[PDB]
Amino acid sequence: HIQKVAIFGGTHGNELTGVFLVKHWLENGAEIQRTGLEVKPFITNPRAVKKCTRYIDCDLNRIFDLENLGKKMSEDLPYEVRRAQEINHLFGPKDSEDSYDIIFDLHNTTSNMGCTLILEDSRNNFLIQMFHYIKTSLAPLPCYVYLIEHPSLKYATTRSIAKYPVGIEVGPQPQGVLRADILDQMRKMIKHALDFIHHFNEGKEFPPCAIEVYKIIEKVDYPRDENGEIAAIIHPNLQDQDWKPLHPGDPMFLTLDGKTIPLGGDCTVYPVFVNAAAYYEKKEAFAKTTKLTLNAKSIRC
Amino acid sequence: HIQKVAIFGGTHGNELTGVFLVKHWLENGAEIQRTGLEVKPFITNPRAVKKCTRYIDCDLNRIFDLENLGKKMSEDLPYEVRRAQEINHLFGPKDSEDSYDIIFDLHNTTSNMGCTLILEDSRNNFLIQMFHYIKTSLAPLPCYVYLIEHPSLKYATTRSIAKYPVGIEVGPQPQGVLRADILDQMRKMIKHALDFIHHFNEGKEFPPCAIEVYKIIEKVDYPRDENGEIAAIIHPNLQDQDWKPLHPGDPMFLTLDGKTIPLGGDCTVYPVFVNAAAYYEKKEAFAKTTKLTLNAKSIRC
Ligand SMILES: CP(=O)(O)N[C@@H](CC(=O)O)C(=O)O
Ligand SMILES: CP(=O)(O)N[C@@H](CC(=O)O)C(=O)O
Ligand SMILES: [Zn+2]
């Protein structure tokens, strides 16, 4: 059933783990080859990799929609828009049946999140089953799932071209830095993801399963000042405590004085992307998520 | 004896702890004010801070020498060269007796180094005594001293304008990220450094003392490709092990294949700036240092 699989690195040019793995596999990709399965590594944003920067003109990972992929090709377009089209033409077109079946898009964050899988559709049995397999196979190494389904949020990502878009994120790693442990963790994530696809194409039957995901609800801004500059910082007790529960009493921010600013609201939330570097650019502190369980049916062929 | 003291933040625009402290103290610098002592906070590279980037045209912290500070002012010069001059004219001139007495230049690294003091002259009794005071005052919080004296090296740093240049570096913090603990650590470093100056200007007598420093000997490159691209990465056992001893047997790098590359040479070395982000730009892995003890005499008003 599953034929065309791709692996994207360098969607942001300062997230090196993907860049390195992909470059290594372009020269020798035996590691990622599975019998009866054609898997293609590919650098998505080579220009931004060259500069070791997030993007050149605009973020590549939020423009794979009709607004942008339908524009008339020209050299006056932002670099990433041109690039987005070239990629859609290679691995897509999107919403087409000639598109790749599965795409893994590799990412790094500074946030202390470890192995993270990113799910775009909560009702997708195939992906849930994959994510279950990976989760299970990594144990006792923790692996979390982050759900970006939202009526009004959710972005037009690079991987979204696929029938089954899979996002992969490993932290904490600084930008422009290549750590071995983080690299090793992403490797293992991949091998199990490919193992799952192979197991599936050899027609293995998976029983129903259930997994905890974390559903984005809101992004929290840093408190500001009358000029609009940031006024407080992630409180020590929240630093590095991604995925762990935070109750309305608990400390959130801290001023340089420093009075504490506690959570507020009436329910427990799970913060993710705590003090992420990519959040500063937009002056955001972290993401509020809701923990919940999803279910899948059985699958075959 | 000591009159003019300055504190520099934003010498690199993505090293936020300095930026934040300095901005906070420009609005209210009571924290850094000591009796009979005028200390001036100051953002060195406002343009690079604006963009949250290391530098605009060239690294500000390498160009405070005759080659650059003697150039004819013009708008065709790289931004940082213009800026370097403006600063030399404010807080210097360098090698002059009208220069500031002491300058603290604040920095962050991604390397797991904690509180670090940077010493440019090994024969300086005043600085050693300060560094001793700070070291001891921070205990049991570790504080290390890194000596950049070298016959065949330079470093025309921002702070070098002063009679007594002091460098301050706290890691690990990602670039474009502001962590509370790291901020707190730098604050304490400053407070004790200012306390020392005040104690000295109230004419306290310090007995002779001794401190371990780490003398740079060379910078280690990443092993490269046949094209010139990086070929291995800091071995897991070296990651985050700054300051700790590394013997010729021990593992250094790691290829994506599995093969370890051990140290070599014939003596124990102490690595610092392990997997520093700012080292990638020049494709360097870390700095080899040699641990040794320095001695100071007594000192007075
Ligand atoms: C921290 P990131 O740059 O990997 N976050 C992405 C989301 C993603 O990776 O899907 C973005 O906001 O574009
Ligand atoms: C991380 P940094 O730019 O403040 N440190 C310099 C050295 C220095 O600033 O003294 C470097 O590692 O290249
Ligand atoms: Zn990313």
XYZ file of C-alpha atoms and ligand atoms in Angstrom:
629
model
C 0.000 0.000 0.000
C 2.729 2.512 1.033
C 5.213 3.282 -1.762
C 6.783 6.727 -1.705
C 8.373 7.932 1.526
C 10.605 10.999 1.984
C 12.668 12.477 4.789
C 13.111 16.211 5.032
C 15.977 17.961 6.721
C 16.885 21.618 6.854
C 13.347 23.018 6.746
C 14.919 25.479 9.166
C 18.591 25.929 8.458
C 19.826 26.216 12.046
C 18.284 22.873 13.173
C 21.287 20.734 12.353
C 20.366 17.177 13.409
C 18.105 16.814 10.360
C 20.668 18.460 8.085
C 23.416 16.100 9.182
C 21.416 12.909 9.042
C 20.030 13.776 5.610
C 23.422 14.732 4.145
C 24.939 11.504 5.536
C 22.120 9.447 4.021
C 22.350 11.109 0.612
C 25.900 9.755 0.400
C 24.933 6.460 2.038
C 21.264 5.779 2.823
C 21.430 2.055 3.541
C 20.358 2.798 7.118
C 16.967 4.037 5.961
C 16.382 1.575 3.134
C 13.748 -1.090 3.695
C 12.932 -4.011 1.357
C 10.132 -3.157 -1.104
C 10.254 0.470 0.040
C 11.753 3.545 -1.683
C 12.749 6.210 0.878
C 14.248 9.538 -0.288
C 16.227 11.949 1.912
C 16.111 15.593 0.877
C 17.217 19.011 2.083
C 14.254 21.354 1.916
C 15.878 24.759 2.515
C 19.535 24.539 1.315
C 19.973 28.313 1.233
C 19.092 28.700 4.931
C 21.265 25.727 5.825
C 24.207 27.388 4.057
C 23.772 30.518 6.205
C 22.898 28.449 9.312
C 19.724 30.514 9.780
C 16.051 29.715 10.364
C 14.904 31.154 7.017
C 15.956 33.598 4.283
C 12.848 35.660 3.463
C 9.982 33.852 5.255
C 9.390 30.649 7.272
C 9.289 27.691 4.865
C 7.185 25.644 7.240
C 4.023 27.764 7.123
C 3.454 28.493 3.421
C 2.449 25.146 1.863
C -1.118 26.320 1.194
C -3.150 27.480 -1.807
C -2.438 31.141 -1.149
C 1.281 30.526 -1.800
C 1.637 27.336 -3.837
C -0.748 28.740 -6.453
C 1.206 31.948 -7.079
C 2.743 32.589 -10.462
C 6.404 31.538 -10.440
C 8.857 34.439 -10.705
C 12.283 35.548 -9.388
C 10.555 38.393 -7.477
C 8.949 35.920 -5.070
C 10.473 35.345 -1.611
C 13.075 32.561 -1.820
C 11.076 30.129 0.323
C 7.930 30.564 -1.801
C 9.868 29.597 -4.943
C 11.359 26.714 -2.981
C 7.988 25.576 -1.590
C 6.730 25.271 -5.169
C 9.793 23.305 -6.336
C 9.223 20.878 -3.458
C 5.470 20.561 -4.067
C 6.307 19.680 -7.671
C 8.870 17.073 -6.569
C 7.096 15.318 -3.716
C 3.504 16.407 -4.362
C 1.393 17.984 -5.692
C -0.479 18.409 -2.415
C -4.039 16.990 -2.180
C -3.105 14.844 -5.199
C -2.912 11.060 -5.411
C 0.508 11.323 -7.060
C 1.893 12.926 -3.902
C 4.263 10.992 -1.721
C 2.506 8.738 0.746
C 4.545 9.614 3.855
C 6.946 12.451 4.661
C 9.010 12.858 7.794
C 10.047 16.418 8.471
C 12.899 16.660 10.977
C 13.223 19.424 13.555
C 15.094 20.532 16.650
C 14.009 22.767 19.517
C 15.828 24.403 22.420
C 12.940 23.327 24.620
C 13.490 20.358 26.923
C 11.008 18.078 25.121
C 12.932 14.972 24.082
C 11.498 12.744 21.384
C 8.369 14.388 20.013
C 5.984 13.247 17.297
C 3.660 15.742 15.692
C 0.155 14.741 14.661
C -1.961 16.876 12.317
C -5.143 14.736 12.211
C -6.601 13.210 15.409
C -8.895 10.835 13.531
C -6.104 9.214 11.486
C -5.799 5.539 12.387
C -2.656 4.897 10.330
C -0.606 7.595 12.016
C -1.815 6.854 15.516
C -0.814 3.228 15.030
C 2.621 4.293 13.789
C 3.031 6.703 16.662
C 1.988 3.952 19.047
C 4.563 1.567 17.612
C 7.330 4.152 17.855
C 6.357 5.194 21.377
C 6.286 1.602 22.505
C 9.495 0.645 20.727
C 11.419 3.526 22.324
C 10.303 2.677 25.887
C 11.560 3.250 28.549
C 12.859 6.304 26.612
C 9.965 8.722 26.743
C 8.283 9.813 23.496
C 5.488 12.367 23.401
C 2.799 13.224 20.904
C 1.686 16.768 20.193
C -1.604 17.353 18.382
C -1.947 20.521 16.290
C -5.555 19.965 15.184
C -7.463 23.170 15.680
C -10.360 24.812 13.801
C -8.562 28.157 13.019
C -4.946 27.363 14.002
C -2.721 24.603 12.485
C -0.273 25.517 9.721
C 0.538 24.675 6.110
C 3.682 22.698 6.873
C 6.330 21.248 4.549
C 5.350 17.670 5.335
C 1.653 18.469 4.783
C 2.121 17.571 1.092
C 1.884 13.889 2.023
C -1.189 11.707 2.513
C 0.362 11.080 5.929
C 2.482 13.997 7.187
C 4.753 13.096 10.120
C 6.616 15.669 12.185
C 9.671 14.797 14.265
C 11.125 17.101 16.917
C 13.929 16.494 19.403
C 15.119 18.824 22.138
C 16.816 20.347 23.953
C 19.465 21.438 21.435
C 20.670 24.965 20.772
C 20.373 26.370 17.265
C 23.527 25.967 15.205
C 24.698 23.149 17.457
C 24.904 19.448 16.784
C 24.695 17.224 19.843
C 25.310 13.479 19.590
C 22.646 12.276 22.057
C 19.926 14.285 20.265
C 21.094 12.902 16.955
C 21.018 9.351 18.319
C 17.445 9.881 19.612
C 16.202 11.071 16.197
C 17.906 8.111 14.477
C 16.054 5.656 16.722
C 12.778 7.499 16.110
C 13.279 7.069 12.393
C 14.317 3.416 12.421
C 11.154 2.417 14.271
C 8.990 4.606 12.030
C 10.430 2.834 8.981
C 10.215 -0.557 10.708
C 6.514 0.124 11.246
C 5.921 0.904 7.569
C 7.768 -2.263 6.527
C 5.830 -4.391 9.068
C 2.678 -2.855 7.582
C 3.653 -3.504 3.946
C 4.414 -7.126 4.876
C 0.736 -7.097 5.864
C 1.032 -7.280 9.662
C -2.259 -6.704 11.470
C -2.209 -4.182 14.302
C -4.805 -4.444 17.070
C -6.646 -1.341 18.195
C -4.602 0.927 20.456
C -4.726 4.093 22.519
C -2.196 6.914 23.041
C -1.973 10.084 25.115
C -1.580 13.192 22.970
C -1.260 16.829 23.937
C -3.702 19.114 22.164
C -2.650 22.699 21.639
C -5.205 25.190 22.915
C -3.390 28.544 23.254
C 0.073 30.157 22.933
C 1.094 32.266 25.942
C 2.790 35.635 25.428
C 5.538 36.985 27.649
C 4.264 39.852 29.752
C 5.378 43.085 28.098
C 6.035 46.746 28.959
C 4.574 50.085 27.764
C 7.186 50.047 25.009
C 6.259 46.452 24.121
C 9.494 44.749 25.223
C 9.504 41.539 27.305
C 9.114 42.105 31.052
C 9.494 38.675 32.699
C 11.072 35.298 32.045
C 10.192 31.634 32.451
C 10.172 30.951 36.198
C 12.912 28.525 37.395
C 10.320 25.898 38.308
C 8.858 25.959 34.825
C 12.241 25.912 33.039
C 12.798 22.534 31.367
C 9.485 21.152 32.717
C 7.842 20.562 29.352
C 4.936 18.074 29.312
C 4.592 18.161 33.110
C 1.336 19.381 34.679
C 0.988 23.020 35.756
C -1.834 24.010 38.135
C -3.432 27.517 38.441
C -1.558 28.184 41.704
C 1.873 27.397 40.266
C 4.614 29.923 39.265
C 4.877 30.865 35.589
C 7.057 33.940 35.070
C 9.528 36.012 37.079
C 10.433 39.720 36.870
C 13.976 40.953 37.460
C 12.826 42.128 40.897
C 11.542 39.419 41.060
C 7.905 39.027 41.949
C 6.427 35.790 40.603
C 3.454 35.722 38.225
C 1.394 32.568 38.760
C -0.656 30.604 36.224
C -4.309 31.650 36.677
C -7.375 30.142 34.995
C -9.336 27.285 36.607
C -7.704 24.068 35.250
C -4.433 22.136 34.965
C -2.479 22.659 31.731
C 0.542 21.024 30.139
C 3.119 23.491 28.815
C 5.218 22.613 25.781
C 7.868 24.480 23.842
C 8.858 26.124 27.127
C 11.305 28.989 26.468
C 11.694 27.892 22.852
C 13.993 30.170 20.884
C 11.631 30.219 17.886
C 8.938 31.553 20.228
C 10.978 34.700 21.153
C 10.857 36.003 17.594
C 7.071 36.297 18.048
C 7.527 36.986 21.829
C 5.766 33.859 23.070
C 6.598 32.002 26.276
C 5.190 28.551 25.594
C 2.143 26.588 24.424
C -0.749 25.509 26.647
C -1.818 21.970 25.841
C -4.531 19.639 27.019
C -3.566 16.026 27.646
C -6.002 13.419 26.303
C -6.205 9.904 24.879
C -6.904 8.939 21.258
C -7.930 5.568 19.814
C -7.224 3.722 16.569
C -8.820 0.703 14.903
C -6.984 -2.239 13.341
C -5.210 -1.955 9.930
C -3.743 -4.050 7.010
C -2.206 -4.988 3.604
C 41.968 54.689 43.219
C 39.275 53.082 40.966
C 36.801 55.608 39.575
C 35.316 54.795 36.181
C 33.664 51.378 35.802
C 31.419 50.227 32.930
C 29.304 47.181 32.167
C 28.832 46.062 28.596
C 25.918 44.054 27.322
C 24.966 43.071 23.820
C 28.505 42.778 22.444
C 26.869 39.867 20.652
C 23.201 40.516 20.040
C 21.924 36.983 20.611
C 23.485 36.680 24.097
C 20.483 38.018 25.990
C 21.408 37.811 29.689
C 23.726 40.829 29.296
C 21.176 42.686 27.177
C 18.434 42.222 29.740
C 20.475 43.107 32.787
C 21.904 46.203 31.115
C 18.540 47.450 29.847
C 17.022 46.902 33.310
C 19.874 48.813 34.928
C 19.681 51.734 32.506
C 16.132 52.291 33.787
C 17.136 51.515 37.331
C 20.772 50.850 38.177
C 20.553 51.027 41.962
C 21.584 47.362 42.113
C 24.991 48.123 40.635
C 25.585 51.438 42.371
C 28.126 51.393 45.162
C 29.125 54.251 47.428
C 31.865 56.508 45.988
C 31.733 54.577 42.716
C 30.125 55.401 39.365
C 29.338 52.345 37.227
C 27.809 52.851 33.785
C 25.792 50.152 31.992
C 25.899 50.298 28.226
C 24.740 48.341 25.196
C 27.693 47.876 22.881
C 26.021 46.486 19.726
C 22.400 47.800 19.655
C 21.916 46.941 15.978
C 22.724 43.245 16.476
C 20.554 43.162 19.596
C 17.661 44.560 17.511
C 17.991 41.668 15.068
C 18.855 39.138 17.813
C 21.993 38.121 15.908
C 25.667 37.688 16.806
C 26.867 40.551 14.600
C 25.845 42.608 11.593
C 28.939 42.833 9.368
C 31.800 41.506 11.536
C 32.383 40.335 15.137
C 32.535 43.374 17.444
C 34.642 41.538 20.014
C 37.653 40.977 17.756
C 38.314 44.443 16.315
C 39.431 46.750 19.158
C 42.981 47.002 17.794
C 45.061 49.528 15.821
C 44.192 47.912 12.495
C 40.532 48.881 12.981
C 40.330 51.669 15.554
C 42.748 53.738 13.455
C 40.697 53.641 10.246
C 39.192 56.841 8.896
C 35.575 57.165 9.982
C 33.072 56.812 7.107
C 29.623 55.305 6.350
C 31.302 52.745 4.027
C 32.903 50.974 6.999
C 31.340 47.802 8.413
C 28.797 48.720 11.087
C 30.807 47.201 13.959
C 33.963 49.086 13.002
C 32.085 52.410 13.190
C 30.620 51.261 16.478
C 33.976 50.115 17.891
C 35.318 53.599 17.305
C 32.308 55.281 18.959
C 32.855 53.077 22.012
C 36.616 53.663 22.137
C 35.853 57.386 22.124
C 33.315 56.981 24.948
C 35.060 54.633 27.321
C 38.650 54.921 26.085
C 40.735 55.800 24.200
C 42.569 52.490 24.563
C 46.156 52.562 25.919
C 45.269 56.015 27.341
C 45.077 57.142 30.976
C 41.693 58.741 30.336
C 40.256 55.311 29.565
C 37.841 53.702 32.007
C 39.555 51.848 34.834
C 37.467 48.651 34.731
C 35.051 47.229 32.178
C 32.917 44.122 32.546
C 31.839 42.627 29.247
C 28.947 40.178 29.608
C 28.544 37.034 27.547
C 26.658 33.794 27.215
C 27.717 30.474 25.720
C 25.873 27.290 24.821
C 28.778 25.379 26.381
C 28.203 23.851 29.792
C 30.701 26.103 31.585
C 28.766 27.861 34.360
C 30.224 30.993 35.880
C 33.392 31.896 33.999
C 35.833 34.758 34.452
C 38.170 35.706 31.639
C 41.684 36.926 32.378
C 43.831 38.660 29.753
C 47.005 39.260 31.845
C 48.445 36.516 34.085
C 50.809 38.878 35.921
C 48.027 41.258 37.032
C 47.699 41.247 40.832
C 44.573 43.432 40.961
C 42.504 41.175 38.714
C 43.675 37.946 40.293
C 42.669 39.275 43.692
C 39.253 40.261 42.325
C 38.818 36.898 40.663
C 39.823 35.209 43.905
C 37.233 37.178 45.856
C 34.477 36.370 43.376
C 35.421 32.660 43.170
C 35.433 32.249 46.947
C 32.279 34.395 47.442
C 30.276 32.252 45.005
C 31.201 28.938 46.661
C 29.828 26.266 46.712
C 28.688 27.495 43.292
C 31.584 26.705 40.989
C 33.399 29.542 39.204
C 36.255 29.021 36.737
C 38.986 31.240 35.336
C 40.098 31.088 31.732
C 43.412 32.687 30.740
C 43.832 34.010 27.184
C 47.452 35.108 27.474
C 49.363 33.676 24.553
C 52.467 34.634 22.616
C 51.057 33.636 19.194
C 47.404 34.593 19.767
C 45.496 37.837 19.940
C 42.053 38.959 21.007
C 41.269 42.694 20.656
C 38.168 42.532 22.793
C 35.593 45.149 23.639
C 36.588 45.292 27.283
C 40.306 45.561 26.344
C 39.924 49.358 26.292
C 40.153 49.366 30.119
C 43.218 49.358 32.379
C 41.602 46.247 33.837
C 39.463 44.356 31.297
C 37.146 41.749 32.876
C 35.243 39.148 30.867
C 32.148 37.383 32.215
C 30.637 34.304 30.622
C 27.803 32.063 31.789
C 26.601 28.864 30.160
C 24.895 26.767 29.102
C 22.258 29.005 27.477
C 21.062 28.811 23.887
C 21.378 31.867 21.700
C 18.224 33.994 21.580
C 17.068 32.479 24.857
C 16.859 34.037 28.305
C 17.029 31.570 31.185
C 16.411 32.692 34.780
C 19.085 30.588 36.522
C 21.792 31.836 34.121
C 20.639 35.417 34.666
C 20.738 34.944 38.432
C 24.291 33.521 38.219
C 25.599 36.500 36.255
C 23.967 38.890 38.733
C 25.768 37.284 41.629
C 29.047 37.382 39.695
C 28.596 41.114 39.186
C 27.566 41.903 42.744
C 30.703 40.304 44.195
C 32.889 41.964 41.537
C 31.467 45.361 42.521
C 31.660 44.478 46.238
C 35.362 43.759 45.739
C 35.999 47.140 44.093
C 34.160 48.908 46.920
C 36.051 46.927 49.599
C 39.235 47.982 47.771
C 38.285 51.689 47.504
C 37.484 51.670 51.243
C 41.151 50.676 51.476
C 40.837 47.035 52.570
C 44.118 45.108 52.434
C 44.049 41.745 50.710
C 46.641 39.114 51.643
C 48.496 37.253 48.913
C 46.443 34.515 47.234
C 46.546 31.742 44.632
C 44.009 30.614 41.998
C 43.780 27.899 39.379
C 43.376 29.228 35.863
C 43.045 27.424 32.554
C 45.494 28.599 29.932
C 44.456 28.276 26.335
C 47.017 26.446 24.204
C 45.091 25.823 20.974
C 41.681 25.397 19.363
C 40.660 21.989 18.009
C 38.983 21.753 14.619
C 36.235 19.291 13.796
C 37.545 16.569 11.503
C 36.432 17.496 7.996
C 35.140 15.978 4.743
C 36.959 15.718 1.437
C 34.825 18.753 0.489
C 35.602 20.582 3.757
C 32.336 19.909 5.639
C 32.287 18.611 9.253
C 32.679 14.832 9.553
C 32.279 14.008 13.266
C 30.681 15.425 16.412
C 31.538 15.846 20.082
C 31.511 12.360 21.593
C 28.743 11.786 24.203
C 31.306 11.422 26.994
C 32.816 14.802 26.170
C 29.480 16.632 25.796
C 28.898 18.997 28.723
C 32.199 17.959 30.375
C 33.851 21.374 30.187
C 36.772 21.957 32.597
C 37.097 18.236 33.364
C 40.324 16.408 32.554
C 40.665 14.535 29.261
C 43.487 11.989 28.854
C 45.083 10.863 25.517
C 43.195 7.536 25.643
C 39.770 9.156 26.039
C 37.037 9.548 23.334
C 36.805 12.926 21.576
C 34.656 12.751 18.437
C 32.176 10.361 16.854
C 31.299 9.727 13.193
C 27.750 8.885 12.149
C 29.016 5.367 11.433
C 30.046 4.553 14.988
C 33.813 5.012 14.940
C 35.222 6.952 17.898
C 38.228 9.250 17.459
C 40.251 9.427 20.678
C 42.326 12.327 22.007
C 46.000 11.618 21.215
C 48.937 13.806 22.142
C 50.970 12.848 25.212
C 49.365 14.782 28.118
C 46.099 15.481 29.951
C 44.177 18.511 28.691
C 41.183 20.455 29.899
C 38.607 21.197 27.198
C 36.529 24.367 27.365
C 33.856 25.835 25.092
C 32.855 22.268 24.259
C 30.411 22.247 21.309
C 30.034 26.027 21.531
C 27.736 27.416 18.844
C 30.107 30.307 18.140
C 32.818 27.750 17.401
C 30.805 26.147 14.517
C 30.927 29.361 12.511
C 34.712 28.842 12.300
C 34.260 25.031 12.438
C 36.017 24.483 15.794
C 35.148 21.763 18.325
C 36.552 23.188 21.553
C 39.611 24.775 23.189
C 42.490 22.817 24.732
C 43.578 24.380 28.004
C 46.330 23.728 30.482
C 45.372 23.979 34.188
C 47.799 25.892 36.400
C 48.026 28.096 39.512
C 48.729 31.842 39.614
C 49.792 34.002 42.555
C 49.100 37.601 43.611
C 50.688 39.945 46.136
C 48.861 42.184 48.623
C 47.119 45.427 47.516
C 45.965 48.864 48.909
C 44.684 52.483 48.677
C 10.627 25.005 17.029
P 10.083 24.692 15.324
O 10.725 25.667 14.418
O 10.546 23.218 14.861
N 8.335 24.870 15.218
C 7.649 24.779 13.936
C 6.497 23.768 14.022
C 6.854 22.412 13.435
O 8.025 21.979 13.536
O 5.957 21.754 12.861
C 7.158 26.128 13.474
O 6.604 26.878 14.312
O 7.335 26.441 12.270
C 30.139 32.717 23.200
P 31.163 34.216 23.079
O 30.997 34.814 21.744
O 30.779 35.344 24.153
N 32.826 33.768 23.375
C 33.879 33.914 22.382
C 35.151 34.237 23.169
C 34.922 35.490 24.007
O 33.830 36.096 23.913
O 35.820 35.888 24.786
C 33.978 32.676 21.507
O 33.721 31.564 22.009
O 34.276 32.769 20.295
Zn 11.677 23.634 13.278
